[PDB]
Design a protein around this ligand. Structure first.
Ligand SMILES: CCCCCCCCCCCCCCCCCC(=O)OC[C@H](CO[C@@H]1O[C@H](CO)[C@H](O)[C@H](O)[C@H]1O)OC(=O)CCCCCCCCCCCCCCCCC
Ligand SMILES: CCCCCCCCCCCCCCCCCC(=O)O[C@@H](COC(=O)CCCCCCCCCCCCCCC)COP(=O)(O)OC[C@H](O)CO
Ligand SMILES: CCCCCCCCCCCCCCCCCC(=O)O[C@@H](COC(=O)CCCCCCCCCCCCCCC)COP(=O)(O)OC[C@H](O)CO
Ligand SMILES: CCCCCCCCCCCCCCCCCC(=O)O[C@@H](COC(=O)CCCCCCCCCCCCCCC)COP(=O)(O)OC[C@H](O)CO
Ligand SMILES: CCCCCCCCCCCCCCCCCC(=O)O[C@@H](COC(=O)CCCCCCCCCCCCCCC)COP(=O)(O)OC[C@H](O)CO
Ligand SMILES: CC(C)=CCC/C(C)=C/CC/C(C)=C/CC/C(C)=C/CC/C(C)=C/CC/C(C)=C/CC/C(C)=C/CC1=CC(=O)C(C)=C(C)C1=O
Ligand code: SF4
Ligand code: SF4
Ligand code: SF4
Lengths: 115, 371, 141, 202, 165, 54, 163, 158, 150, 50
């Protein structure tokens, strides 16, 4: 079957990091110390714990990416059935690509894709 | 957005872009630099205090430890302070040798600026490319002075020793090869689209701001100001050679890069002209050269200020004597220490990745910023 | 004769379930500590069993002597160093928690350690990772 | 008399094939990939840069410089360590994972060098801060001398056994008391050149 | 020369029994190793497995090894002009380490690095040291080679004629 | 090398490519040259050398 | 409107050309011989005035201690006593610690008897710091020239130019 | 002889004192600390574009602390620029000198160095804190009567 | 589509000039800053495996894969190569695939050591304003050309 | 790479075995589970494409 190899390969690929972690645990020594476990901050003592809180206008491309992922997912089955059918699916997906282009133009002009 | 939204990161002494042990406390608002605070002094060895309680012949090894890339400039300022105080003349051959060594050190300093600058931009190969020829410069220095760095070659009223046999042709061949190498560097780097788009419009400095902030050298000359202390103060024999002061009108980092490339080319021209017209005669001053107890140079009782055009700007020495071997006061005016204070103004409202470009545009090495 | 070194330095009562915490935003960026190969004085609560350091507890001074063992330590020598540390801390009452004060305290503590080594109280630790004798080579009197 | 003393220990192990060859191969692997910290402080780092460059190659020994301490085996201390920098140096050494090695390069890292006499802030040798395996004398040591020091470090690394691992973990003794000092916030808060034009106060 | 030269210089060879037999028979051994180092630890490791404790001696700053190793020697710590000249006396290094070793140790092995800088007579004394101190083995790197080869140190120093290998 | 690396990973532990001594007479590291003048000392590098100097 | 697209075209081809130019400039270095000096199998021959380990002649020393005063740190230790029969300074011990030495060259320059010399002996690394305290016997050892080691390829930096 | 700047100041009625010249003949003037903040603006008005260096030094141990300013002009078409040295003296017990950061920004770091090494407090400097020494340090190292308080890592490497 | 696939795969493999999350000069090591031991090796393997799989997908999707033949010309060598079938044919196909993969392994390894690295804003601009509309136009051209097939 | 093997062939193997023998370092301030899971997820999702 064409998919039992997929499951076996997935199991092996998940097992490999477990084997690496086990081998490191049984081979590498442990010498923990309070200075060693401190977070690295280029020598100096770290201040408050991490955290940046970006601006919204920077990370507004993600809302475009969510929609565009769905559009590119929807475009695949049409391409798979483009040869069995004819110009009907061409006309069908032309509106999809045109709406994608119009949305990209709107995001470009409104400044959503500006950093 | 005042607090708990602003990330204060200590891009401190251990950072690849931080040249040496410079620390920046950078406050970021989503990769946007709100401001930065420079903390220096991680290499403060108290060299001004060690300048006292040391004779000049003892303090000369200490001199090369500020601006360790351009060591001959610091050696020149240290040996020309007291020799101006004592009215000691320098022979013409020694002056020509000094000019040649200073220009070679300027070439090496501009190279080892270009390396870390392009590394901070993102290109690592130019570092090895500059080191291929800085090793040749080191070979010339070791053939002449005896060591690659920390030469201890400059002396009061002259130099340590004459140039060895077969040095002029070696230096001329180095100049011929290095011109080709510089053309290769400009072919690889100067018009690159990524390099330009990382450099073209960062750190715009006005000429008035450059004057007020105390900037000197390629920093001040990259704001529309043609101010070189070699042609203003008539240092050594720079009035005899044909050379041009490299200055640019725009204030960005690209102007500084172009200025340093042109300064390397003009320096090469200066070595060629100096070696073509080298004079004869003595090099050490025979008047000062005189088991018996040997005193050092007793400085006169007056104040003095001496300047030099270091590759990083203007390097100065304020010397107050005390009619004794040990100077009463020895203040060092470092070009990098004064060029660094404009960095928070430049990086304000810029981005995090632009800090590397701005700091690489300024020729800062931490051994000269503190003393 | 007698017991001697009867001060018997009393540590603070041991806490449980102490978790590692960084310094706050206003108090961060500073060392509030003196670290050196033989002495680490931290303005923090460090427990040895779980290697957890709480740096928000600035009212406690944790002293770790000889983390990389260069001397062989008995309990009496540890008690001597600890009573000296307590006396030094009580001597500096009213001083700020800055790095300067803790570095001074560590300097006197290491001078005491060197005096103990040269008096015969402690000996250099063989079977150490390095043998460099940072306090001086073995010499005769 | 500053005497020396060997503590009480047990017998090692003794093995035929598995443990001995595994230890030898681990030693060989740690020989050829001693990744430096890229720790640079002062003029000696320039010569360190000359060992990254083309004329003398770091890559022949492996020895790729890694910025993060967690990815670095060897710290090659190049430069004078001031009082302001020494706690940072000790942190960086402590944050490096075991096994870790230290090479003190330069006269300023062994004993303070020129600053051993009159400098009021120069630490006279990092052996007062970090345990040094190989001492490298010389002001700007020649890059070949740096390679020789690294070769001697490899000579000592290949001699290691499993017992040396329990020589490397810290003993981790602590002692906690109240201090009744004055607690003060950090002077360097990060506020710099913000609203500067309103700070005249005539 | 080739063939054998370009064939495996691998570190899995069975030379180790011969190495231990030679270091037990010939007390003082001159060793030659790869220039980049690190292939000596395979041979010193088994010596350390037998209970031998290593004393690392640098031959550059050795300074007349007779009184440096087998006698109390005077050394002046470096004053930098802040102190008067002091004359310290240091214990004999190899004998101090011998008398301070634990009773279960097989002995002490003196690892003399960079022994090429020593003269002929210093190598003579380094070869004849185990005769005076029974529980001392001498290992001295007298050079470098493509592969690890060892010889008796008396042969290199000139006490025994150099037999062709 | 990229194609045949699975076959090179086996042979590499059983091969050494360490550079040979300058004179082709040094049978042993303790051997002395017959006449120490026929050796070629002073190999140059890339700025001033040909392929003969390697 | 079309001119904007045309300008976008010409400012894109230029970037591709300059990226290819960077690629060509970098890859032209593959046809050039390496500059790397393969230490420790190859050693660079030091200059005639290279400042390395000090060599000290015990017979020529007069214990005048000017080498101490000329030192930036007063490093050399000259333990001497007066030989009352002749009233000349008899040298007892001479020691230079190379952990503090910076190889500046002041001692070898200001020595009146010229008993102090600079050798080519670099690579003085030791495992122990206190082993760097060279006395008058260690300083008196002749340096090992790399030209006498025949297992390595001695590299000369430049042509000899003695013609 | 009266310098050009001193003659200009006496023409404009500004109090000062001429201390002479250095070895290069540059004028040296002494300005009282109370008038220095007003005189610096007038100095820039004269045309001193460039604050070349700001320095501080000890006149004598247990004596006055002197702060030194070097000034020159950066202009197109001037052959020999005019340079002036100016010294302001403050008592050791409580040294107070007005800051020229609001006239020349180049003093921004430099005066901090003068505060870090000699303890001269500058009034209108907005960020006056230690720059070279550690920020928690107590004492001014460059004063002639300073004594280092016996730190362990400064002592001899034993 | 070939150029856009190369640039996009180089960005996904996070190779330079798109090494921003692991940019050593801006951040100390990026997300690998606190990672030590076997985990850094895992995040190294994964990167090189991504590079290898991107090169393999380049030689599969855009190059001919294991195929090497010119039917329109009388190439004796290519015809004789394609005439082999069996174990030897599969071996030659593996050889051809590995060579074509090594071409687009050689190119990005060079690319890392030649160009400077991008910036985050410019990375976003290149991804969203230069590559996406161009890929949409390429898809439209592909569909228009494929209209002739049916 | 020249010394780890004949022509540096064993250099990457030496790096891998060194990282195997290098102490596994976990952050005390952060989360252990996410720290251990992240690289494993990355390598699994990258290996699944082969
Ligand atoms: C293998 C390919 C290596 C080169 C790809 C790296 C990325 C790149 O080209 O960015 C380098 C530059 C970045 O170019 C920038 O981003 C946009 C791209 O059009 C706009 O032109 C911006 O104005 C321009 O500054 O990309 C280009 O200009 C396209 C070059 C195409 C090369 C093929
Ligand atoms: C963006 C991808 C990279 C683009 C740039 C790649 C680098 C181009 C080459 C730069 C170095 C030039 C070296 C000159 C060698 C001179 C000797 C020689 O063999 O010259 C031939 C050049 O030989 C070569 O082919 C050079 C090797 C190129 C392949 C290796 C690099 C792959 C990437 C001349 O033939 P040609 O120029 O007509 O050959 C090219 C033509 O397309 C063949 O049909
Ligand atoms: C480098 C290694 C060598 C190159 C690759 C060798 C394998 C590639 C060729 C075989 C697989 C691709 C073609 C499929 C058809 C084929 O020949 O399959 C064989 C697959 O052969 C194998 O089983 C693998 C051979 C050993 C693998 C290499 C050693 C037939 O053997 P079988 O076991 O399916 O049938 C034999 C008999 O009639 C019983 O059914
Ligand atoms: C087949 C490929 C088809 C698409 C061609 C390539 C993509 C467009 C090339 C032009 C381009 O990249 O635009 C530049 C040049 O574009 C211009 O002509 C500048 C004016 C932009 C006007 C506002 C944005 C609308 C642009 C629409 C472009 C097409 C949209 C997608 C079409 C599929 C940059 O403009 P900007 O985003 O920096 O402009 C914003 C700025 O603030 C100025 O307003
Ligand atoms: C049997 C397996 C062990 C083995 O083959 O040893 C080698 C390989 O073992 C290892 O070091 C571990 C890797 C496993 C393969 C070590 O030799 P080397 O290749 O480092 O030295 C040979 C020559 O002197 C230099 O090339
Ligand atoms: C063989 C299979 C058996 C049989 C077991 C598996 C062994 C194995 C293959 C273990 C893991 C090996 C990888 C595979 C180990 C880690 C390799 C990375 C992958 C190592 C990182 C080293 C850098 C450190 C590598 C690239 C690198 C090179 C360089 O020159 C510079 C300047 C920089 C900044 C770099 O990052
Ligand atoms: S040896 Fe010391 S003083 Fe000399 S350059 Fe190196 S760090 Fe600076
Ligand atoms: S200067 Fe020369 S002769 Fe005088 S004490 Fe020093 S080494 Fe001896
Ligand atoms: S070389 Fe210089 S530093 Fe060394 S001992 Fe001589 S004078 Fe002192």
């Amino acid at each position: 079957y064409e998919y039992d190899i997929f499951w076996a390969f997935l199991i092996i690929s998940s097992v490999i990091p477990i084997l690496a972690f086990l081998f490191s645990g049984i081979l590498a020594p442990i010498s923990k110390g309070p200075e060693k476990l401190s977070s690295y901050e280029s020598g100096i003592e770290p201040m408050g714990d991490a955290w940046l809180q970006f601006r919204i206008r920077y990370y507004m491309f993600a809302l475009v990416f969510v929609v565009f992922d769905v559009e590119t997912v929807f475009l695949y089955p049409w391409a798979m059935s483009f040869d069995i059918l004819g110009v009907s699916v061409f006309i069908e997906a032309l509106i999809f690509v045109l709406i994608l282009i119009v949305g990209l133009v709107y995001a470009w002009r409104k400044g959503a894709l500006e950093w | 957005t005042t607090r708990k939204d602003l990330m204060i990161v200590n891009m401190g002494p251990h950072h690849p872009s931080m040249h040496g042990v410079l620390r920046l406390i950078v406050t970021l608002d989503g990769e946007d630099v709100i401001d930065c605070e420079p903390i220096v002094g991680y290499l403060h060895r108290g060299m001004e205090k060690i300048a006292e309680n040391r004779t000049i012949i003892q303090y000369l090894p200490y001199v090369t430890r500020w601006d360790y890339l351009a060591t001959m400039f610091t050696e020149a300022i240290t040996v020309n302070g007291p020799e101006q105080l004592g009215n000691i003349q320098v022979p013409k051959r020694a002056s020509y040798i000094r000019v040649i060594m200073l220009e070679l050190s300027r070439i090496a300093s501009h190279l080892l600026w270009l390396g870390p600058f392009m590394a901070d931009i993102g290109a690592q190969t130019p570092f090895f490319y500059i080191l291929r020829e800085r090793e040749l410069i080191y070979d010339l220095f070791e053939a002449a002075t005896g060591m690659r760095m920390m030469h201890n070659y400059f002396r009061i009223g002259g130099v340590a020793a004459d140039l060895p046999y077969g040095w002029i042709d070696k230096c001329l061949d180095f100049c011929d090869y290095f011109l080709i190498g510089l053309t290769e560097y400009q072919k690889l780097i100067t018009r690159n689209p990524i390099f330009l788009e990382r450099v073209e419009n960062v750190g715009i400095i006005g000429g008035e701001e450059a004057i007020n902030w105390g900037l000197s050298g390629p920093m001040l000359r990259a704001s529309g100001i043609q101010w070189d202390l070699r042609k203003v103060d008539h240092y050594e024999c720079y009035d005899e050679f044909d050379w041009e002061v490299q200055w640019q009108k725009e204030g960005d980092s690209l102007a500084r890069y172009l200025i340093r490339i042109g300064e390397m080319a003009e320096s090469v021209k200066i070595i060629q002209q100096a070696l073509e017209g080298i004079p004869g005669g003595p090099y050490e001053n025979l008047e000062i050269r005189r088991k018996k107890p040997s005193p050092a140079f007793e400085l006169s009782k007056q104040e003095l200020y001496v300047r030099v055009e270091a590759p990083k700007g203007e390097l100065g020495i304020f010397l107050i004597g005390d009619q004794s071997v040990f100077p009463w006061r020895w203040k060092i005016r470092p070009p990098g220490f004064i060029n660094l204070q404009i960095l928070p103004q430049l990086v304000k409202k810029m981005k995090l990745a632009d800090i590397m470009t701005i700091l690489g545009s300024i020729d800062i090495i931490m051994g000269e910023v503190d003393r | 004769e007698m017991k001697e070194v009867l001060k018997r330095a009393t540590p603070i009562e041991a806490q449980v379930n102490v978790k590692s915490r960084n310094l706050e935003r206003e108090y961060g960026g500073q060392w509030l500590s003196s670290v050196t190969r033989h002495v680490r004085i931290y303005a923090a609560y460090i427990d040895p069993v779980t290697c957890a350091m709480d740096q928000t507890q600035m009212d406690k001074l944790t002293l770790m002597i000889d983390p990389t063992d260069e001397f062989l330590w008995n309990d009496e020598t540890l008690n001597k160093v600890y009573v000296y540390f307590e006396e030094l801390v009580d001597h500096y009452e009213g001083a700020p928690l800055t790095e300067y004060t803790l570095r001074l305290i560590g300097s006197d503590i290491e001078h005491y350690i060197r005096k103990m080594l040269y008096e015969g109280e402690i000996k250099y630790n063989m079977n150490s990772r390095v043998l460099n004798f940072s306090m001086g080579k073995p010499r005769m009197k | 008399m500053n005497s020396i003393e060997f503590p009480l220990l047990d017998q090692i192990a003794q093995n035929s094939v598995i443990s001995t060859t595994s230890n030898d191969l681990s030693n060989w692997s740690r020989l050829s990939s001693l990744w430096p910290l890229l720790y640079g402080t002062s003029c000696c780092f320039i010569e360190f840069a000359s060992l990254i460059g083309s004329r003398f190659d770091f890559d022949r020994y492996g020895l790729v410089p890694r910025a993060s301490p967690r990815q670095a085996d060897l710290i090659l201390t190049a430069g004078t360590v001031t009082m302001k920098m020494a706690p940072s140096l000790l942190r960086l050494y402590e944050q490096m994972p075991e096994p870790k090695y230290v090479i003190a390069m330069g006269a300023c890292t062994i004993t303070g060098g020129m600053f051993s006499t009159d400098s009021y802030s120069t630490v006279r040798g990092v052996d007062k801060l970090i345990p040094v395996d190989v001492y490298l004398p010389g002001c700007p040591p020649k890059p070949e001398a740096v390679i020789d020091a690294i070769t001697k470090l490899r000579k000592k690394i290949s001699r290691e056994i499993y017992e040396d691992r329990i020589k490397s973990q810290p003993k981790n003794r602590c002692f906690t008391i109240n201090h009744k000092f004055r607690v003060g916030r950090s002077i360097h808060t990060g506020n710099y050149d913000q609203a500067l034009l309103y700070k005249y106060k005539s | 020369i080739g063939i054998r030269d370009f064939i495996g210089g691998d570190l899995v060879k069975f030379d180790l029994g011969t190495w231990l037999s030679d270091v037990e028979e010939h007390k003082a051994i001159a060793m030659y190793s790869p220039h980049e180092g690190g292939y000596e630890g395979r041979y010193l490791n088994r010596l350390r497995y037998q209970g031998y404790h290593f004393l690392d001696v640098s031959a550059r700053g050795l300074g007349d090894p007779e009184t440096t190793l087998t006698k109390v020697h005077p050394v002046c710590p470096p004053h930098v002009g802040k102190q008067p000249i002091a004359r310290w006396w240091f214990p004999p290094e190899v004998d101090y380490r011998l008398e301070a070793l634990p009773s279960d140790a097989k002995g002490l092995v003196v690892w003399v690095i960079e022994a090429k800088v020593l003269s002929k007579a210093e190598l003579q004394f380094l070869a004849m040291l185990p005769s005076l101190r029974p529980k001392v083995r001498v290992i001295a790197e007298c050079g470098n080679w493509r592969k690890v080869m060892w010889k008796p140190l008396k042969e290199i120093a000139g006490l025994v004629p150099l037999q062709e290998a | 090398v990229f194609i045949f690396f699975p076959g090179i990973l086996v042979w590499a532990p059983f091969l050494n490519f360490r550079k040979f001594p300058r004179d082709p007479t040094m049978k042993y590291p303790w051997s002395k040259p017959e006449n120490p003048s026929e050796v070629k000392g002073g190999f140059l590098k890339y700025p001033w050398a040909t392929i003969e100097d390697y | 409107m079309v001119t904007g697209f045309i300008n976008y075209g010409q400012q894109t081809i230029r970037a591709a050309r300059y990226i290819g130019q960077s690629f060509m400039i970098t890859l032209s270095h593959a046809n050039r011989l390496p500059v790397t000096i393969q230490y420790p199998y190859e050693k660079l021959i030091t200059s005639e005035r290279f400042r390395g380990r000090i060599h000290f002649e015990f017979d020529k020393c007069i214990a005048c201690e000017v080498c101490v005063r000329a030192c930036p740190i007063d490093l050399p230790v000259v333990d001497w006593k007066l030989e009352t029969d002749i009233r000349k300074k008899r040298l007892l011990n001479y020691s230079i610690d190379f952990g503090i030495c910076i190889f500046c060259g002041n001692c070898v320059e200001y020595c009146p008897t010229n008993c102090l010399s600079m050798t080519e002996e670099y690579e003085l690394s030791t495992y122990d710091r206190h082993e760097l305290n060279y006395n008058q016997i260690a300083l008196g050892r002749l340096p090992i020239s790399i030209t006498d080691d025949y297992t390595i390829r001695t590299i000369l930096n430049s042509p000899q130019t003695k013609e | 002889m009266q310098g050009r700047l001193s003659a200009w100041l006496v023409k404009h009625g500004l109090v000062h004192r001429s201390l002479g010249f250095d070895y290069q003949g540059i004028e040296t003037l002494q300005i009282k600390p109370e008038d220095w903040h007003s005189i610096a603006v007038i100095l820039y008005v004269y045309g001193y574009n460039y604050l070349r260096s700001q320095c501080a030094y000890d006149v004598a141990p247990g004596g006055l602390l002197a702060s030194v300013y070097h000034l020159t002009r950066i202009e197109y078409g001037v052959d020999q620029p005019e340079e002036v040295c100016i010294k302001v003296f403050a008592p050791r017990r409580n040294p107070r000198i007005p800051s020229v950061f609001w006239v020349w920004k180049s003093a921004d770091f430099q005066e901090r160095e003068s505060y870090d090494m000699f303890g001269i407090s500058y009034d209108n400097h907005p960020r006056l804190k230690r720059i070279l020494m550690p920020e928690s340090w107590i004492g001014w190292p460059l004063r002639k009567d300073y004594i280092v308080p016996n730190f362990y890592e400064i002592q001899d490497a034993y | 589509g070939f150029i856009v696939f190369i640039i996009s795969s180089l960005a996904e493999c996070e190779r330079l000039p798109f090494d921003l999350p692991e940019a050593e000069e801006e951040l100390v090591a990026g997300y690998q800053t606190e990672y030590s031991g076997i985990k850094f090796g895992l995040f190294y393997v994964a990167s090189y495996l991504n590079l290898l799989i991107s090169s393999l997908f380049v030689t599969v999707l855009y190059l001919g894969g294991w195929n090497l033949s010119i039917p329109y010309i009388f190439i004796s060598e290519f015809f004789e190569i394609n005439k082999i079938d069996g174990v030897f044919g599969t071996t030659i196909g593996i050889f051809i695939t590995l060579a074509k993969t090594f071409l687009f392994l050689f190119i990005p390894i060079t690319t890392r050591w030649t160009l400077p690295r991008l910036r985050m804003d410019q990375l976003l601009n290149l991804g969203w304003k230069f590559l996406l509309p161009i890929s949409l136009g390429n898809l439209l051209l592909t569909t228009s050309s494929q209209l002739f097939s049916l | 790479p020249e010394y780890a093997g004949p022509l540096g062939i064993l250099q990457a193997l030496a790096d891998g075995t060194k990282l195997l023998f290098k102490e596994n370092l976990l952050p005390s301030r952060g989360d252990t589970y996410l720290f251990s899971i992240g690289p494993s997820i990355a390598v699994i999702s990258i290996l699944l494409g082969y």
